[PDB]
């Protein structure tokens, strides 16, 4: 159960927030878990994805162990585009197939001044549950 009286549990209202979320909220919804090798090193469960991140596909028709990078993040479709995840058009051109960020695991990140700042901050409060909780 949820106990916060100001937190919505309505189905129609929750779908309204999801489909009409602003762009800075759209990035937060598009978070994907890190690969298992990253997970002990950074102590971070999941993370929003950016334009240049190495991606394995876990579910769907394009799942496998192949390593591909993101092409662009299409926040209007809840869709990201991966390098070699693409299908053949009729005329001979190639079209990138959209994969939802939920069926995405990140094997390598895109380190930055603002990217690195979240890593200790997400790993800070991750530890706090192990001093206060213990």
């Amino acid at each position: 159960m949820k106990f916060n009286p100001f937190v919505t549990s309505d189905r129609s209202k929750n779908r309204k927030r999801h489909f009409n979320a602003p762009s800075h909220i759209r990035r937060k919804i598009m978070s994907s878990p890190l690969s298992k090798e990253l997970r002990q090193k950074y102590n971070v469960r999941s993370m929003p994805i950016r334009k240049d991140d190495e991606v394995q596909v876990v579910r769907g028709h394009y799942k496998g162990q192949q390593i591909g990078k993101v092409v662009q993040v299409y926040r209007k479709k809840y869709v990201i585009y991966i390098e070699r995840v693409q299908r053949e058009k009729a005329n001979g051109t190639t079209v990138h197939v959209g994969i939802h960020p939920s069926k995405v695991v990140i094997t390598r990140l895109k380190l930055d001044k603002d990217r690195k700042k979240i890593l200790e901050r997400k790993a800070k409060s991750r530890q706090v549950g192990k001093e206060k909780g213990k």
Partner: protein, 259 residues
């Protein structure tokens, strides 16, 4: 339904003649809704017959003695093994149906302790039955915040709260109830009686003070005693073949005399 529904339109019947059906109709206009029929429950749009009001008698009041009577009947039927089986509870491995547990479980603060307690008491099979009963609801309730339904589980009754509510509320089917504040809606779900109940030691001893015995009234109610029985020996099979009746009976006639 809103009281302005079907009444915001301005309409007037065309009267007799004009080969129309005398219904009030929309006053003019170069649109589809023009002379189309506004009022009446038979027409498209407009008011429906007998609009529901907010002042319908939603609530009902019950006598205090009758409210306390069903709780006594609900508690008494929870100690008979045959009635609880008819509620579907999978508790055939429970050692004693009046399940009385020590007062140490109030100090529980983790759900893993509560799960292990149910495994040790062999009541986990009813919670395991709850998992098999989880399915999305039939009908229009799925889009009205009633998407998922599940079976009732065992009810845990505690005298005092020291963390037992926190450690038990995450297990589905588990419903917590205070001793002084009982509820017939959670002791007899659906109107049927005989829900599986789990009691603590202080919970099990406080029942003699909230309702009393037949020779001593309740110490926490102002004026309340246990109701009397209409009949005492309810097993009429023992009564019917008892010797005292059997003398003053005629010979049974069981020879079939057809036409």
């Amino acid at each position: 339904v809103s009281e302005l529904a079907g009444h915001q339109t301005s309409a007037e019947s065309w009267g007799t003649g004009r080969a129309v059906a005398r219904i009030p109709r929309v006053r003019g206009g170069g649109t589809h809704r023009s002379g189309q029929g506004a009022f009446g429950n038979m027409c498209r749009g407009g008011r429906m017959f007998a609009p529901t009001k907010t002042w319908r008698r939603w609530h009902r009041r019950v006598n205090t003695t009758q409210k306390r009577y069903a709780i006594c009947s609900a508690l008494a039927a929870s100690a008979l093994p045959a009635l609880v089986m008819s509620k579907g509870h999978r508790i055939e491995e429970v050692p004693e149906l009046p399940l009385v547990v020590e007062d140490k479980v109030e100090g529980y603060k983790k759900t893993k302790e509560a799960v292990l307690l149910l495994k040790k008491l062999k009541a986990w099979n009813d919670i395991k039955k709850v998992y098999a009963s989880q399915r999305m609801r039939a009908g229009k309730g799925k889009m009205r915040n009633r998407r998922r339904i599940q079976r009732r589980g065992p009810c845990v009754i505690y005298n005092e709260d020291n963390g037992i509510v926190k450690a038990f509320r995450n297990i589905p089917g588990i419903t917590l109830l205070n001793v002084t504040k009982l509820n017939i809606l959670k002791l007899a779900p659906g109107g049927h009686v005989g829900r599986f109940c789990i009691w603590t030691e202080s919970a099990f001893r406080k029942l003699d003070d909230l309702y009393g015995t037949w020779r001593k009234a309740a110490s926490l109610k102002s004026n309340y005693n246990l109701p009397m029985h209409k009949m005492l020996n309810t097993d009429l099979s023992r009564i019917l073949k008892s010797p005292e009746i059997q003398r003053a009976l005629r010979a049974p006639r069981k020879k079939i005399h057809r036409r």
